């Protein structure tokens, strides 16, 4: 199939970062609230800022299992090489959009690059997407992984755990073509194109899903590996 039981992704929630997020959040809506569509419930929260890798679909308490003990496999063929037992410092910072339209924006997206300003982090999730897909246990992406973050989407409206392509309209078997919504980002791009959220230390890729939660509301780990 391809419903996305679990997903493979970095967890950005440090407390640096989400001040960061929240702070982006505030000024938001005090010099954009005006504009459509913009208001505090399309905002991410910011207990779950991450970075996806990989789209999932584990059947068996086996197969989880098999998941862990592939990643470990990532660790000893190439995560040790880019990481060098040290993890990635790197910077959430700057914003962007996917579509052409920036009065029409349905997804807004912090961007994330190492701070040493290098091409380590791309081709770490490229390398474990591939010993992934040996494994039939990933979803086929068309697009390449993007390094960003979601911070805004018109689906948490709706859906707050909403990852993507899997949420309230698409989950499972009833694929429903409900148009989704948009707002004006004409504004807050050009005040917060550059916007700083935070430095952090990558050192994990979780498993994770989209409604296994602890009591806070962040992602509960099903399983992951670590660079150091």
Not at 47 to 69: P, R
Not at 147 to 168: Q, S
Not at 189 to 205: D, H, V
Request: with cysteine; net charge negative; hydrophobic share 40%.
């Amino acid at each position: 199939g391809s419903h996305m039981t679990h997903f493979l992704a970095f967890f950005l929630n440090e407390v640096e970062v989400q001040e960061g997020f929240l702070r982006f959040q505030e000024e938001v809506l005090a010099k954009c609230s005006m504009d459509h569509g913009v208001d505090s419930s399309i905002f991410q929260n910011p207990k779950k800022l991450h970075l996806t890798i990989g789209m999932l679909v584990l059947l068996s308490e086996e197969e989880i299992q098999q998941t862990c003990e592939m990643l470990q496999q990532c660790k000893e063929e190439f995560i040790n090489d880019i990481s060098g037992g040290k993890p990635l410092e790197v910077e959430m910072a700057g914003i962007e959009y996917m579509n052409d339209d920036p009065g029409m924006v349905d997804v807004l997206y912090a961007k994330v690059h190492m701070k040493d300003g290098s091409n380590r982090l791309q081709e770490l999730v490229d390398r474990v997407l591939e010993r992934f897909q040996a494994s039939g246990l990933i979803v086929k992406e068309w697009n390449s992984v993007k390094l960003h973050a979601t911070v805004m989407n018109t689906l948490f409206r709706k859906d707050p755990n909403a990852e993507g392509r899997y949420n309230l309209y698409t989950a499972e078997g009833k694929y429903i073509f409900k148009e989704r919504e948009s707002f004006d980002g004409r504004n807050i791009l050009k005040l917060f194109e550059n916007f700083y959220f935070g430095s952090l230390k990558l050192n994990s890729i979780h498993i994770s899903q989209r409604f296994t939660v602890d009591s806070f509301g962040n992602y509960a780990s099903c399983g992951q590996i670590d660079f150091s």
